[PDB]
């Protein structure tokens, strides 16, 4: 009902060495 | 099939209308 | 009112009331009732309003545009003069449009006013309408939405080349 935000699943896509 | 043909058409029309890619500095 | 030359109305011919039957028509009684109940109070209120118009008489004026040089005698790419030429040409374009509208109003009023004999009795208005539509079409048709005095001059020059070639090929 509220606004979507990044979960852990979305946030872990930008934590590695390369994209 | 698309981008190679469009690029070759651009090179053909650069031959025709005289399009310079490494253009000499004039001004 | 208006000007009876630009809006011509031929002289009205009404027939006299010729009562043949003894039964009184309702229309004369309703006309007298309309003349008493409706025409008189409206006319009195209009006279009051017209007295109040007379208590402050002030005027307005029809704006005049003196003729500036047209696009033919303006230099190429000289915007100070061809701007004036374009403003003159656009004012003449809108005025030519209203001339065509006046001739259309004449033709429609002639058709209704003549009724069933409209084809016989409105030949002159139809002739004037054909001439003014031919003139307006030769002057302003097919210019496009980005019309200008240059487009109109080029259309006039192409038409004059066609007329000169048609004159030459006839001899």
């Amino acid at each position: 009902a509220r606004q979507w935000q990044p979960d852990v699943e979305w946030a872990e896509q930008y934590g590695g060495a390369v994209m | 099939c698309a981008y190679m043909g469009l690029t070759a058409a651009l090179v053909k029309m650069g031959q025709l209308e005289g399009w310079k890619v490494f253009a000499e500095p004039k001004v | 009112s208006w000007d009876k030359d630009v809006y011509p109305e031929p002289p009205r011919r009404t027939p006299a009331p010729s009562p043949q039957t003894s039964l009184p028509n309702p229309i004369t009684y309703l006309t007298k009732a309309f003349d008493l109940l409706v025409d008189r109070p409206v006319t009195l209120v209009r006279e009051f309003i017209e007295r109040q118009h007379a208590k402050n008489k002030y005027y307005y004026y029809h704006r005049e545009f003196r003729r500036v040089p047209d696009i033919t005698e303006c230099h190429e790419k000289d915007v100070l003069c061809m701007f004036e030429a374009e403003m003159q040409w656009k004012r003449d374009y809108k005025v030519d449009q209203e001339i065509v509208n006046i001739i259309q109003e004449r033709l429609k009023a002639c058709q209704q006013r003549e009724g069933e004999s409209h084809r016989q009795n409105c030949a002159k208005e139809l002739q004037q309408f054909t001439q003014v539509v031919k003139a307006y079409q030769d002057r302003y048709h097919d210019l496009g939405a980005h019309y200008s005095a240059r487009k109109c001059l080029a259309k006039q020059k192409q038409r004059m080349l066609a007329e000169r070639k048609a004159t030459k090929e006839a001899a």
Binding site: - | - | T72, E73, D142, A154, K155
Partner: protein, 120 residues
């Protein structure tokens, strides 16, 4: 381009001939935009250090606006000077070479033939 011009008297921010040009007014809209950049700088300075943005350091915001207007005034003087030098060199080069800029004959549209393309 103009680097041979400011090579006879190098490292002059404003030369002497720049004093023959009208300086910008203090109500120059360019200089007013530079003062607004100073006010924005003061607000960002209070924002990044968690101060009240519109309240804290009014002397500091005043020095931000003052310092940006002060630097921008001389920057606008040099800007106006360099465009004046560009036009001076342009006009003196056109005057010193009349053969390269011929007075091309002005034809009115009564002689100019343009092709009419009808929209139909």
């Amino acid at each position: 381009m103009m680097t041979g011009r400011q090579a006879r008297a190098p490292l002059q921010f404003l030369p002497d001939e720049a004093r023959s040009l009208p300086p910008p007014k203090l109500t120059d809209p360019r200089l007013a935009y530079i003062g607004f950049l100073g006010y924005c700088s003061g607000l960002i300075d209070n924002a990044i250090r968690r101060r009240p943005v519109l309240s804290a350091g009014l002397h500091r915001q005043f020095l931000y606006i003052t310092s940006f207007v002060f630097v921008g005034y001389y920057l606008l003087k040099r800007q106006d000077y360099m465009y004046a030098v560009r036009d001076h060199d342009m006009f003196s080069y056109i005057k010193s070479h009349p053969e390269d800029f011929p007075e091309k004959d002005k034809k009115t549209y009564r002689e100019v033939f343009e092709e009419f393309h009808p929209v139909r």
